[PDB]
RNA sequence: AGCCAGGAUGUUGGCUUAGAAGCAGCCAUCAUUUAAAGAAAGCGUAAUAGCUCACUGGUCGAGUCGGCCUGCGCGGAAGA
């Protein structure tokens, strides 16, 4: 989750699992579970829900300006 | 299946095999409520594994009475007792071993039963289909004695009178042992585990006998809870016997290679007969019930009659989605199940030819009805379609089904992230 | 006997000692139950204070037995809502440790001298005296 | 240094024979003989065995300490002998023994039979572990390293031939 | 290993050795710190 | 980091209190936790006094330089590891025996409390309360 | 150097009332206890664990430890 440009906010451990909260950007999550299952031996799942907005320097959005609908 | 050398009349055992991938887990979700029991297969060397615990949770949600098979005793490094203990400590179950292993790998020839107290070594050499009992084998007699004694203690704690009778120094008969073990296996007490090797065809012949001995019947499993459209709870317990009006449960639409519908339907109560009328009580829709088909011995038998507990499939036009009830106009409308998994992986998709967006629209429309664990989307940043599925493979075996079923090719892509600026 | 395998030195606000999903990912791998988790550590802590983490032991038995003698929150640890300043150590040279008086600091070092004992009570007194100045600012009286 | 400047005190019942440079030590286990580097002076001297650097040989003290340690090991071999213990971790890894041949079943398609050198007797108290016994330290260490090299331990699941005391430093496969 | 023209101890656990006229580093703890020449 | 000056100073400082003081005890504790050598030391400081440092001084000439001032036969503590504690309250008091009492209870070993020939005592307990 | 234990009671130092938990969020801390606790520099790092900073304690008893200047060498050093 830290590899992804995501920030963790608390990780309470309930029994038989650990509950880990982190407001990760959506761009850094487009195949998460398959990788997460590799990381968890297929014993974990993730639930994500949009919260807010912030910035990270990426002219990749300048890369996608004139490719479609200039 | 009549019985392995001990037989008791034709039983139509009805079998739904289950897949093993979390990717396509809805076929295990729908096919666990529809089930009365479940044979929890296991790898005698792999043991219990991510999917085994996953399907364990699946069954626990429906409290299905489950017995377990332990396959793969020929592979080197396989040991029945270790996997048995794994169940005891990886799933929090009470794994009563109603069998035992005679050897491992090459050694495997038979299994020590704790009630017959014999170990039948099948005649695999001519054909597995032939079988033979053997009196009290010395190799496992000390191990079997201690493990069999353990089984009697479970039979005892099974009934209160029995417990005290077990404290009477007296043993248990060929009916109180099983009837004690069975009568609560119906109620989610303990999972019976038998070992075998479907490759070498041993253990299995006995496994079928255990299913009759302990796995529940539609008359043994408790009666089904029911409800109407408005009455918060019309009890609607449909007594299983087909004396109530016809009341089934449809669990899977099918892309039949020829028919195009083949929605399987599991009849709990009542009797539909080669042409009747029932409504989509979950959808508020009406249509007839034409051509029931039940496939047995791999021959696709066509049936004009389907009854209580009788698993079959239907050819029709009007859609019945998975977990949708097929009750009579009497209508115990809603059955409690209204659950489908939310998609865990969402990927964009678009055809290779720019004019098959309509065809890819209609194909994904159909492939979205065929399983509920597969959403299709239209996000508003752009018209781009998003095929949100459960797993990578779940929606990777659908990008090529369009290639196979609907002869349309698509090119997937990462979804476009909504980027607003300020 | 069993202190070695389960191990988390952590105490959240002890209005309820050790709430189950409140602490963090070290006690999740700890079989200790919640039935007696905050019964005698939310009420019997009144020997020092209520609202401060009750310093306790993490000793249970493999036979499911649980015995321990809980210590108290420090007089410096209590210096977040009881001794005034919510700020404290790390910046006692760039900030104040609070309007702390030694007319109270010595009394607190003497009356809270039960858990950390010694040959002479002045030893635990100097212990707490270094504990407060472990921030860098202590009552100069 | 203070290695060679320390006598190898022979036990009771061992027969040492310092013939020139090459030297034999007889014992209860067997017989070990060693050709000392010519830069070493060794005497019996009343139940001991002492080494001293010959004159004209700048590397006299290195060879002195070396020869002293080697003869100490030879003595301990002829009286006690050294016993190496190996284990087979990994599923289906079994190492049954037939006389002077260790039949290792270590996962290769081909069968593995390492014919022991003269002097090392391998036994297996279990399907999956070897216990080498021998008279010479160097050759038993060599046989252990020979067996271990067939299926060396690996950094992920410890599978392979390992010494009983070996501390295999493992690691995780990947994040992925 | 690395064949840098300059071997140095990268860890507390590394050792300088001169096997066969080549100056190697043999770190028992981290096998990345294992160096050959120079 | 015990320098020679500091060495001769500390040996003399820990030997003077025992030389002009009373009969004390020592232990042989090479395997104990901070807690075991700590609570026993607190007990020992409560019994007699807080002057005793629990550090050990069993070097081959630590006691062979301090104990040999008078009653030099009391220089028999060289071979085994030792961290002593004084007992001003009476010869062969509880402190001169509490170490050996705890030798098998919550403590490793107590060097048998060899004693010292201050009055040239023999095998017996020096103080008996006739009371 | 080798060989026999330990590296607190504030001790999760309060230390940005999520902890960066003896060793990343920042800092100044033996204060009985001392040979110990540094209150941080890898294994977890979020703890533990057993090694870790070090240090004594015992064991046996001869030099050892670093840097500086230096002579000759060593690797750096691959072409048809
Ligand atoms: Mg040069
Ligand atoms: Zn290194």
Number of domains of chain C: 2
CATH architecture of the largest domain in chain C: Orthogonal Bundle
What's the helix count of chain F?
4
Spatial order of the strands forming the largest sheet of chain F? 1-2
Walk me through this protein's architecture.
The structure is cut from a larger assembly and holds two copies of chain A, one copy of chain C (141 residues), one copy of chain D (176 residues), one copy of chain E (38 residues) and one copy of chain F (131 residues). Helices cover 19% and strands 6% of the residues of chain A. Chain A is built from two helices and two strands; from the N terminus they run E-E-H-H. In chain A, strands 1-2 form a two-stranded antiparallel sheet. Chain E has 38 residues and is mostly loops. In chain E, strand 1 and strand 2 form a beta hairpin. Chain F is globular, with a radius of gyration of 14 Å. Chain F has a single domain, classed as 2-Layer Sandwich (Alpha-Beta Plaits). In chain F, strands 1-2 form a two-stranded antiparallel ribbon. In chain F, 31% of the residues lie in helices and 3% in strands. Chains in contact: A-B, A-C, A-D, C-F. Chains A and B meet through helix 1 of A and helix 2 and strand 14 of B. Zinc ion binds next to loops of chain E. Chain C binds one RNA strand of 80 nucleotides through helix 2. Chain B: This is Elongation factor G. Chain B: Keywords: Acetylation, Cytoplasm, Elongation factor, GTP-binding, Hydrolase, Nucleotide-binding, Protein biosynthesis. Chain B: It catalyses: GTP + H2O = GDP + phosphate + H(+).
Topology:
This is part of a larger assembly, with 2 copies of chain A, 1 copy of chain C (141 residues), 1 copy of chain D (176 residues), 1 copy of chain E (38 residues) and 1 copy of chain F (131 residues).
Chain A: E1 7-8, E2 22-23, H1 32-40, H2 60-63
Antiparallel strand pairs in A: 1-2
Chain D: E1 15-18, E2 23-26, E3 31-34, E4 40-43, E5 50-53, H1 60-79, E6 82-89, E7 97-98, E8 101-104, E9 112-115, E10 120-126, E11 129-134, H2 137-148, E12 160-163
Antiparallel strand pairs in D: 1-2, 2-3, 4-5, 6-11, 6-12, 7-8, 8-9, 10-11
Chain E: E1 16-17, E2 24-25
Antiparallel strand pairs in E: 1-2
The complex binds magnesium ion (MG) and zinc ion.
Chain C binds one RNA strand of 80 nucleotides through helix 2.
Summarize the structure.
Chain F: GO terms for molecular function: large ribosomal subunit rRNA binding; ribosome binding; structural constituent of ribosome. Chain F: Keywords: Acetylation, Repressor, Ribonucleoprotein, Ribosomal protein, RNA-binding, rRNA-binding, Translation regulation. This is part of a larger assembly, with two copies of chain A, one copy of chain C (about 140 residues), one copy of chain D (about 180 residues), one copy of chain E (about 40 residues) and one copy of chain F (about 130 residues). With about 70 residues, chain A is mainly alpha-helical.
